[PDB]
């Protein structure tokens, strides 16, 4: 009753501690949230604002599948996870996971 | 030292710390010297101290006279700065000694770098006029000297063009 997603967004559009914005090359303002898919600073993409969200991360070396109430896991496996708790975005996530896999 | 050298085995250095001679005169002397064989430079310096050949004052030439000797350097003005020459002579001697200490033959040595910088001036007072103290500073100088021993892309079209040009010429 006191708190809602819009309100949260309003609170944290500016004063976050995941926002990183480029001083050099002024266009670009990123959100480095644990539950942000594409790393845009928008209410419709951020982990903080959205209720249900399912990002893939790197965390500490090994890739982690994260979910929102908050859950953590570890290509086929990823797909299965998505199928289990899911709500285009899935495709995007999958794509991201591929990229993450490439890293080490 | 201010130069670029590559092989210091063929070079002989020499310096003066804070010489109590006028920068301008000594600068002139240095200019006169530079790119000379060392021995020839020495000879020249000796001549100037015995007032036989002048050093031509080309840069710092305000008021400096109009000697007969300056014709040798295509110039009107010149002087015979004695003290400066003596100081310079000393440093040349030092350089020569250094060369000797190394295995450099002093016949083949050229002055590649005769640098004279101005050093920090010693301050004295002169008294003027209506109770006015003015500075009466020396203009001493650092001298550095370095003697030194002395003795793509083709392309097919471009190629074709070239060939054509050649043919045309023929």
């Amino acid at each position: 009753s006191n708190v809602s997603n819009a309100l949260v967004w309003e609170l944290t559009r500016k004063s976050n501690c995941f926002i990183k914005k480029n001083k050099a090359g002024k266009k670009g303002v990123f959100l480095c949230d644990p539950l942000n898919v594409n790393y845009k600073n928008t209410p419709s993409s951020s982990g903080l604002v959205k209720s249900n969200s399912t990002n893939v991360t790197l965390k500490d070396g090994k890739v982690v599948f994260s979910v929102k109430v908050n859950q953590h896991f570890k290509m086929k496996n990823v797909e299965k996870l998505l199928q289990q708790h899911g709500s285009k975005n899935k495709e995007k996530l999958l794509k991201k996971y591929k990229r993450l896999s490439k890293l080490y | 030292y201010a130069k670029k050298i590559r092989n210091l085995g063929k070079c002989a250095k020499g310096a003066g710390v804070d010489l109590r001679v006028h920068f301008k005169n000594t600068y002139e002397a240095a200019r006169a010297i530079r790119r000379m064989k060392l021995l020839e430079a020495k000879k020249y310096l000796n001549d100037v101290i015995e007032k036989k050949r002048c050093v031509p004052f080309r840069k710092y030439n305000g008021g400096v006279g109009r000697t007969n000797q300056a014709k040798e350097f295509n110039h009107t003005q010149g002087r015979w700065p004695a003290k400066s020459c003596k100081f310079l002579l000393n440093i040349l001697d030092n350089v020569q000694a250094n060369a000797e200490s190394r295995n450099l033959d002093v016949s083949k040595l050229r002055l590649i770098h005769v640098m004279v910088n101005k050093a920090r001036p010693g301050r004295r007072r002169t008294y003027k006029a209506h109770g006015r103290i003015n500075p009466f500073m020396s203009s001493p100088c650092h001298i550095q000297i370095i003697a030194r021993e002395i003795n793509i892309s083709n392309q097919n079209r471009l190629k074709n063009k070239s060939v054509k040009k050649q043919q045309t010429v023929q």
Partner: protein, 52 residues
């Protein structure tokens, strides 16, 4: 020159202060806000975090 009689403190309305306190408490409540504030709270179940 700087002087000791610059106004150093500010009076803040008691009520306003109280309100602020309440709002901070509320914030501490809300998980997302806490996260934003910078804490590594992803592995805590309940964010009004109460202990025996």
């Amino acid at each position: 020159p700087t002087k000791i009689w610059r106004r150093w403190g500010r009076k803040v309305n008691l009520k306003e202060k109280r309100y602020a306190v309440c709002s901070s408490i509320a914030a501490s409540g809300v998980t997302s806000l806490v996260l934003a504030r910078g804490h590594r709270i992803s592995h805590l179940k309940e964010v009004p975090l109460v202990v025996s």
